């Protein structure tokens, strides 16, 4: 049976170059057409480029035309996509896919595991933690940090009940932000101290923010 | 409008009663010949390997042409690269040897 | 170009569902469907006419009338809660085009209304000349919600960031939404609203300067 090995999960700055490579085994490769098809984080599939069995026909989605290039080496059962001048919107997972026929087409009967490509303007940044003052509900806004991930805890890790950390959202600025919100009794606001522990290891940051009632 | 000799003209199918020539819907269905049929035949839709050489009219069904590097009535085939011993690929013919 | 399919549908286990994909080029190019279980390579389901690769269930069936293709699952089992996209060539013939995808949920747990909590900007942030509203949603099933922001009465698209729903310990979903604004934009309006449309019904929370 068919096998397809992608590779090269790359982090790259905008305007930079990658060369996604796909190798294929377990079927005659030069009998069949190929194509790259992507998908940005949790937002629908998108066709990138197509190639003919021989290498003649080559199709490119308007969103990439002129920027990327497609080519196969039937001698090495390989298919590439050179990327040039990346865009922040090229942030996607990229699947090399076998088109069912010999001609250039839209029936991808096989899909590689897909390589992840990340394009970010931003550089490493520590978070700016703001407290979310107040059964009461308080928390910590872990605003503007790069890259992923970050560890949130409470009272030196001594509290694990009522704790909820939400997955971080990449902003249009390219800097992540998340919230952790804990639920506590109304009586606790007079007898207990509430500090969150935010540790961002990629930037070597440890911030302990006190949450006091406004 | 009116069925000549029990038959409706190309691009039409006769009505249920027998008195009217209803026209085929362009893009949807067609008829090629003088006929007393109850419906027009639906247009052929193109498969992957193919492009729409002539779009489907009312008098004419759709022509799907095999793409660059293949040829044809069920699926586009890959062209024979070389010839056998002692002996050009088009969108409708293999290589001739 | 662009063929539009509903972003979210549902079925009760053992029932039938038809996912339709609509686009003025599906008048002259056969469709084709894929299935994408969360964090797998899409898996081809029904290519054109109505033929299915070896290995995909009988249950599945592709159809076409006019400018609409339609994937149809009979007796949808548990192992069908996945994303199904469609594709054809574009209007011409050179490009390929994918449907916006449909989140097909298979009904396991009974339906749950979302739990909204909205936070106005903290004084510390405003002192740094910043302002961020935080709208936190949880405990909803099925996991597909429309989050909207309002300035008094007017829809606000700019400054908004939102996450894609995810399964909690309770199997229900949760999502977060953020509105970044200048403190001058914060004071210029009477009220700011976070509106969560789930299964039609919308839950609204409001905060004021």
Short mmCIF file of N, CA, C and O in Angstrom, two decimals, chain A residues 123-127 145-151 176 198-206:
data_model
loop_
_atom_site.label_atom_id
_atom_site.label_comp_id
_atom_site.label_asym_id
_atom_site.label_seq_id
_atom_site.Cartn_x
_atom_site.Cartn_y
_atom_site.Cartn_z
N UNK A 123 9.31 38.23 17.83
CA UNK A 123 10.44 37.61 18.52
C UNK A 123 10.03 37.21 19.94
O UNK A 123 8.99 37.66 20.44
N UNK A 124 10.85 36.37 20.58
CA UNK A 124 10.60 35.90 21.94
C UNK A 124 10.20 37.06 22.85
O UNK A 124 10.88 38.09 22.89
N UNK A 125 9.09 36.90 23.56
CA UNK A 125 8.63 37.92 24.50
C UNK A 125 8.07 37.27 25.76
O UNK A 125 7.35 36.27 25.70
N UNK A 126 8.43 37.84 26.91
CA UNK A 126 7.83 37.45 28.18
C UNK A 126 6.44 38.05 28.30
O UNK A 126 6.14 39.06 27.65
N UNK A 127 5.58 37.45 29.14
CA UNK A 127 4.22 37.95 29.31
C UNK A 127 4.13 39.18 30.22
O UNK A 127 4.99 39.38 31.08
N UNK A 145 2.76 37.28 24.79
CA UNK A 145 3.99 36.50 24.95
C UNK A 145 4.25 35.63 23.72
O UNK A 145 3.32 35.27 22.99
N UNK A 146 5.52 35.29 23.51
CA UNK A 146 5.94 34.46 22.40
C UNK A 146 7.24 33.75 22.77
O UNK A 146 8.11 34.35 23.41
N UNK A 147 7.38 32.46 22.39
CA UNK A 147 6.34 31.65 21.75
C UNK A 147 5.56 30.80 22.75
O UNK A 147 5.42 31.17 23.92
N UNK A 148 5.05 29.66 22.28
CA UNK A 148 4.27 28.72 23.08
C UNK A 148 5.20 27.66 23.68
O UNK A 148 6.22 27.32 23.07
N UNK A 149 4.86 27.11 24.86
CA UNK A 149 3.71 27.38 25.72
C UNK A 149 4.04 28.17 26.99
O UNK A 149 5.12 28.77 27.09
N UNK A 150 3.11 28.17 27.94
CA UNK A 150 3.31 28.79 29.24
C UNK A 150 2.60 27.97 30.33
O UNK A 150 1.58 27.34 30.06
N UNK A 151 3.17 27.95 31.53
CA UNK A 151 2.61 27.20 32.67
C UNK A 151 1.98 28.15 33.67
O UNK A 151 2.64 29.06 34.18
N UNK A 176 0.97 35.72 21.74
CA UNK A 176 -0.07 34.91 22.38
C UNK A 176 -0.65 35.54 23.64
O UNK A 176 0.00 36.38 24.27
N UNK A 198 3.17 32.45 36.88
CA UNK A 198 3.33 32.40 35.43
C UNK A 198 4.80 32.22 35.08
O UNK A 198 5.64 33.08 35.37
N UNK A 199 5.12 31.08 34.48
CA UNK A 199 6.48 30.79 34.06
C UNK A 199 6.59 30.55 32.56
O UNK A 199 6.07 29.57 32.03
N UNK A 200 7.28 31.47 31.89
CA UNK A 200 7.55 31.37 30.47
C UNK A 200 9.01 31.05 30.28
O UNK A 200 9.87 31.93 30.31
N UNK A 201 9.29 29.76 30.10
CA UNK A 201 10.67 29.25 30.01
C UNK A 201 11.48 29.73 28.80
O UNK A 201 12.67 30.00 28.94
N UNK A 202 10.85 29.82 27.61
CA UNK A 202 11.60 30.30 26.44
C UNK A 202 12.20 31.70 26.59
O UNK A 202 13.18 32.02 25.92
N UNK A 203 11.61 32.53 27.46
CA UNK A 203 12.13 33.87 27.73
C UNK A 203 12.67 33.99 29.16
O UNK A 203 13.03 35.09 29.59
N UNK A 204 12.71 32.87 29.87
CA UNK A 204 13.18 32.80 31.26
C UNK A 204 12.48 33.79 32.20
O UNK A 204 13.13 34.61 32.85
N UNK A 205 11.16 33.70 32.25
CA UNK A 205 10.37 34.65 33.03
C UNK A 205 9.54 33.95 34.11
O UNK A 205 8.85 32.97 33.85
N UNK A 206 9.65 34.46 35.34
CA UNK A 206 8.82 34.00 36.46
C UNK A 206 8.16 35.21 37.11
O UNK A 206 8.83 36.02 37.77
#
